[PDB]
Amino acid sequence: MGPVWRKHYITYRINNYTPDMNREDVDYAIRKAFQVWSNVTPLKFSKINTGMADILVVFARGAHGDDHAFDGKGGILAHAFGPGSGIGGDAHFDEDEFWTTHSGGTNLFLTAVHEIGHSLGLGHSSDPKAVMFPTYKYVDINTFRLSADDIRGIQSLYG
Ligand SMILES: NC(=O)[C@H](CCC(=O)O)NC(=O)[C@H](CCC(=O)O)NC(=O)[C@H](Cc1cc(-c2ccc(-c3cccc(Cl)c3)cc2)no1)CP(=O)(O)c1ccc(Br)cc1
Ligand SMILES: [Ca+2]
Ligand SMILES: [Ca+2]
Ligand SMILES: [Ca+2]
Ligand SMILES: [Zn+2]
Ligand SMILES: [Zn+2]
């Protein structure tokens, strides 16, 4: 259930960049992660560099100014706030992970899909093939698809 955005145009901004990947690969992973969700809802996402974005994307370490301190390498990979003003919507990625484009380390795209689900108001799935299942798993990103449960969940919130 959860809170939802009360509009269908949502902006995001990348506050800072992990040194683990180059800038263009970070931008690509995030853009594609938003596209997964826009593909099955009325939502549209635009990246901005200037202005007040709804969803701020942040890489940070350990205790980083909120109530969800990170824990070093492993364990919690990221956390995101549900829809709302201010820190609402924002997605934080633990810099103590090694973010990648691929299967090594922690794949940024797949983690971002999961986190953006939370930023849009989804909770966890019991479907062990759903991207909103609680625990990270690498799957071939070239053939990645939302599960029927993920699509059901997001279409129940928007549209
Ligand atoms: N246990 C694991 O598998 C990895 C280990 C990471 C490592 O050791 O490198 N860690 C994890 O999975 C940890 C577990 C955290 C925990 O419960 O203690 N999860 C987290 O770190 C959550 C963040 C997270 C989950 C994922 C994810 C999940 C599923 C899939 C996927 C893709 C395709 C198919 C399938 Cl079946 C699954 C891909 C990525 N990506 O990010 C934390 P969060 O859910 O945002 C959260 C919830 C509540 C609060 Br309150 C704060 C944050
Ligand atoms: Ca961690
Ligand atoms: Ca916000
Ligand atoms: Ca890192
Ligand atoms: Zn945080
Ligand atoms: Zn989660």
Swiss-Prot record:
Ca(2+) 1 binds at residues 20, 95, 97. The keyword Cell membrane does not apply. It is found in: Secreted, Extracellular space, Extracellular matrix. Ca(2+) 3 binds at residues 71-72, 74, 76, 94, 97. Ca(2+) 2 binds at residues 54, 86, 88, 90. Its main location: secreted. GO terms for molecular function: calcium ion binding; collagen binding; core promoter sequence-specific DNA binding; endopeptidase activity; metalloendopeptidase activity; sequence-specific DNA binding; serine-type endopeptidase activity; zinc ion binding. The keyword Calcium applies. Induction: By exposure to bacterial lipopolysaccharides (LPS). Inhibited by dexamethasone. GO terms for cellular component: cytoplasm; extracellular matrix; extracellular region; extracellular space; nucleus. Zn(2+) 1 binds at residues 64, 66, 79, 92. One of its GO terms (biological process) is negative regulation of type I interferon-mediated signaling pathway. This is Macrophage metalloelastase. It comes from Homo sapiens (Human). The gene is MMP12.
